[PDB]
Amino acid sequence: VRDNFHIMLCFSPVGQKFRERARKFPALFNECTIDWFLPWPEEALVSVAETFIKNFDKLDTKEETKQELMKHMGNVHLMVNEICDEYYQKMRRQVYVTPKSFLSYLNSYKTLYIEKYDELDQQEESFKIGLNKIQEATITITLITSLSGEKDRWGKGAQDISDQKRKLVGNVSLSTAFISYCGPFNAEYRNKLAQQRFVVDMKKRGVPVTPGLELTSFLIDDATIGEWNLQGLPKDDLSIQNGIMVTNSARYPLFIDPQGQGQNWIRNKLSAITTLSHPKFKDMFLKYCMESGLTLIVENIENEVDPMMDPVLELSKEFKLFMTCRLANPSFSPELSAKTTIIDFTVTQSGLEQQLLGKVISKEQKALEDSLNQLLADVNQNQKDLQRLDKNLLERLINSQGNLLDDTELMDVLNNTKTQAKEVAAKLIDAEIKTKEINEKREQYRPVAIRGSAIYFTMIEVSLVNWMYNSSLEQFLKLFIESIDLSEKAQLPSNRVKNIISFLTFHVYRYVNRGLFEKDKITFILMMAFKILTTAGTISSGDVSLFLKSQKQISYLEDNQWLNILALSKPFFKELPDLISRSENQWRNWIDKNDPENFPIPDFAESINQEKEIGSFISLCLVRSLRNDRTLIATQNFISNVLGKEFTDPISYPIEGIWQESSNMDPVLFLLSAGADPTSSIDELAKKKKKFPCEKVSMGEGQERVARQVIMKGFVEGGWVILQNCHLGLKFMEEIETLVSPINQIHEDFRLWITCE
Amino acid sequence: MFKQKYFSDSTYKVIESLTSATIALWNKVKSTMLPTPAKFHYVFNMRELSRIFKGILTCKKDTINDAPKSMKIKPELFLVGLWRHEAERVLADKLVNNKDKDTVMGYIQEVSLESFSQIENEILEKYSSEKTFLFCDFLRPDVINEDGIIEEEAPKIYEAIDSLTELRKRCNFLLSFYNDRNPSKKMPLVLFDDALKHLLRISRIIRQPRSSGLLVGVGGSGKQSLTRLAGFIGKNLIQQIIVTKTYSDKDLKEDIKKGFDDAGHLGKQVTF
């Protein structure tokens, strides 16, 4: 048996466990031979490129450029390695690569090249049909000057796509690279970095390429774009490339989905579902979808794969499958990147303000939306009318395909062309009537949307400050729409825009404070102020870092103080530590005086402090650098200034008031600290307004079924339940979300109260 | 081993010099290049000397048959080339950067010149040259020829010579075979020079009686893909473990029992 039992072990080189696993078991690395596999060098990659280009060089015929093509393709691969490294280095988000994706990229290149070569060259065959029309007209010889633009397009479009045909081959390469590889990337790296990267490769290679990307334009007809925009696809750029990426469908995809754009899109795109965790799903739902094609959507990936999921992944020929994640910043394995494409639907603020703009136009007065959608439908149909003009030109040009001139009705046809342009002129006028009127109706509100987006991207980051400060966009949307309903319209619409800016901020602010902890109270308001000013006031992130982080000259002050002199010393911070600051005339009392900021103000820059557009921030850089002792009250002070003193004021939550928020279909969590519990007060209220004592179940071990049966009693009746100590025994928590649902109906007046740590 | 041919008028003294020059190489390499926590497994002992010899001891008379090749080959030349390839594959493999490889090959050339102080110009012309020399393989050199049945005769097994063309052609031949053996094989394996070498190394380890080899590399390097062919050529059966919905221990035990009974009672050849 030992003579004929060979053992082949294949490990990863990276991670954590490999090295100490080797140290744990000596015989493992001892007896076995050891062999390394370095990554493929450029020679191997060009070899693969020519193995795949020989069989694919049917239409791409060019000597002395093919060899440079295969070379440059290797260069592209070596580069996406480096881009991966840089992304992980800066953003601490994992990215991987495999030769399988390179092969798939070659597949995409070949397939979409034969497709676009054949299609666009049938169109260029039609450019040559235009040449045939010109030739037959000339040799046979009113219309010749009417077809000035027509003959010009017929010649020059073909001549451009032709003389740049190798540059257009380059364009195909850029497009298919950006498709296949640049799925999982953020907006700074997506286009900018990748584009400059590929075009510098092309310039160094000296192979010819066309100026201008316009990736979306020459990929998909805008008719399907509009059709999707009816299907809920967001009207902005990033969603456009995302839809393209799903369209190409090189492999089954997997989305990073902080908000839920993809789930709703697929829910609407062609479908109009079965979760991963279900005993029937693993057996039933699989066989139904695999033998009759139900499309089997999944929505609960959390990096944990039931292994049976995989060999299904890699035999009905009518079956597809889209599956997505929920929690952002995934930690997907390298090979989970090998199988499926990855797409990030991390919302940018840029699209966010348009979405909020649409929703405010809705709720503030529906007549604005009536005018909006009316003119928008009209102008969309008028774009389609320009398309119908194009159809009319094509009909004029190739329906007869001979004897166009003998058709004297062609004269009427020529006139018909003119008539269509006339309605385009009306549409042209509408483009002005749109781009001012709706725009000013939007300019009344697009500041608001800006603020709204700012607020949201503030409250995102506190989640990274600590877990459990996590919430959706949906709750924020409910709060936003409500705020509009609560106080928005009185009269004098511009004044009510200013009242938006007053009220919305306070509403969302208080909502988040209800969950915040003491030491984080001051911080969230501080971040809100900065994120407000990073757009309007254009406050430098460098000056922010100056405000966060930071002696020969002066003699009286302390070494503890001289550290701070050098801290401030390294615009006019490096211009006024001299004899101005070293006067030592009256500021000695100042540094002695308590509350330096308020009564004994620095007169070092009296006008700068007077202006106040930035003078606050200047005063604060000064206060921190000089006296870190009194940072926090100064923090309260300029918060009161730039945001209003209403923020720096006490709040205490009336539990009777809070009860009004809790509908039956939402629970009440409680993030408590040592030496504090509201349980007595909750019971007291349940004796005051409600007439019965609540039931209580403490988490632990062997309490799931007890909790479930008491909850069922509450469902049928309408009592109150008090869970306790959820910080251990978390396996029951995931069940609760399924229970509290619209499906299983619940009697009114049923509340739930949750406590944890 | 020596007292079989008796044709070594001078190659016996050489052979002893090989016995000592392996030791000289062992001393130099073991001293010079060390383990650090990024290259912790750079560990050397007396095992590798045994492995070197275990590789050498083969071809009781197949080494003598230089007459078919005679590619400017004296009988000793093939022997020193075998020594070189052996020392490379037992020492010049488990090293991380190609530079480390380049220095061990420099060591090898220096030591070969040191011992081989009687034909040094010939080795410099032919095998100490960086050009490819004596790729050793078992299935390429002989062709079944499919006379009456496909597997007409077991190929000669001991040795092969240096060439890349017929290597790739038989590899593609074999790839087509593997395609029609396995339903839904779905294996677009691209065969380039380094991939061919890696398949050769897997062959070297799998074949040997009482051998095994740890394979390291990032995913996508293909080792899991390469081993399937490498096992099929060697007739070895292969089985993988499947982690059920319940992750437990009994699957391992029953699978190993079946493996032994394949390699025991039945006595077949297997791989894990």
Ligand SMILES: Nc1ncnc2c1ncn2[C@@H]1O[C@H](COP(=O)(O)OP(=O)(O)O)[C@@H](O)[C@H]1O
């Ligand atoms: N030489 C190769 N050429 C093309 N594709 C490859 C090659 N090697 C591996 N792959 C791709 O990588 C996938 C996984 O290969 P695998 O053998 O698991 O590599 P590793 O063992 O390094 O993870 C395969 O399904 C295959 O598509």
